[PDB]
Paper text:
The [name] RH protein, termed [name] (235 kDa in mass), has been shown to be a potential virulence factor that allows the parasite to invade a wider range of host erythrocytes. In erythrocyte binding assays (EBA) it has been demonstrated that [name] of [name] binds strongly to erythrocytes in the presence of ATP, whereby weak interactions have been found in the presence of ADP or the absence of nucleotides. In this context a 94 kDa domain of [name] of [name], which is highly conserved amongst the RBLs and called the nucleotide-binding domain ([name]), has been found to selectively bind ATP and ADP. Based on these traits and the absence of significant ATPase activity of [name], this domain was suggested to serve as an ATP/ADP sensor during the invasion process.
The second domain, NBD94566–663, covering the amino acids close to the nucleotide binding segment NBD94444–547, has been crystallized by vapor diffusion using 2-methyl-2,4 pentanediol as a precipitant in a form suitable for X-ray diffraction analysis. Peak wavelength (0.97898 Å) data was used for the SAD technique in which 12 out of 18 Se sites (6 SeMet in each molecule) could be identified by SHELXD that were further refined by SHELXE. The electron density map for the main chain atoms is excellent showing the typical sausage like features for the helical regions, whereas for the side chain atoms no visible densities could be identified. The structure of the NBD94566–663 molecule consists of two helices that are linked by a loop, which is not visible in the electron density map. The length of the long and short helix is 97.8 Å and 48.6 Å, which are formed by 65 and 30 residues, respectively. Due to the kinks from residues Tyr60-Lys62 and Ser85-Glu87 both helices spread apart by an angle of 40.2°, thereby forming a hinge-like feature. The longer helix of chain C in the asymmetric unit is highly distorted when compared to the other molecules. By contrast no nucleotide-binding could be observed in the constructs NBD94566–663 and NBD94674–793. In the crystallographic structure, the residues Gly61 and Ser85 of the N- and C-terminal helix, respectively, are in a very close proximity of 9.8 Å and the very N- and C-terminal amino acids of NBD94566–663 spread apart by an angle of 40.2°. This structural feature of NBD94566–663 enables this protein to move either like a hinge or like a rattle up and down, thereby transmitting ATP-ADP modulation in NBD94444–547 with up- and down movements in NBD94566–663, which have to be coupled to the α-helical and chair-like NBD94674–793 fragment of the C-terminal region of [name], representing an elongated protein with three subdomains of 96 Å, 35 Å and 20 Å in length.
Residue numbers in the entry: 7 to 72, 76 to 107
Write the structure that this text describes.
């Protein structure tokens, strides 16, 4: 204990300098969620692109490209009439919240 005061130093270099590792040991699991974050974000933003061309852009272009009108009817118009799913989502939210 006298010279073996270097045992409290060992005690320190132990637990104290051991729990030093169990910090960066969570810094990895962090750099996983952090990693996953953008890793999906961008991947999807890529399939949010294909829409803008195939929708909005290909819309105006096709809505200039021109029975045939019947297709133009069931087109963008019934494509908006799809969004009845929001009402098929609203009252549901307004359900499990009373």
């Amino acid at each position: 204990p006298m010279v073996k005061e270097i045992e409290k130093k060992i005690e320190n270099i132990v637990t104290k300098i051991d729990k030093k590792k169990y910090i960066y040991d969570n810094m990895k699991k962090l750099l996983n969620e952090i990693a996953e974050i953008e890793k999906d974000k961008t991947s999807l933003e890529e399939v949010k692109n294909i829409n803008m061309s195939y929708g909005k852009s290909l819309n105006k272009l096709f809505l200039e490209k021109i029975k045939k009108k019947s297709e133009n009817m069931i087109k963008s118009m019934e494509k908006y009439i799809k969004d009845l799913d929001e009402i098929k989502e609203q009252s549901p939210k307004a359900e499990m919240n009373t």
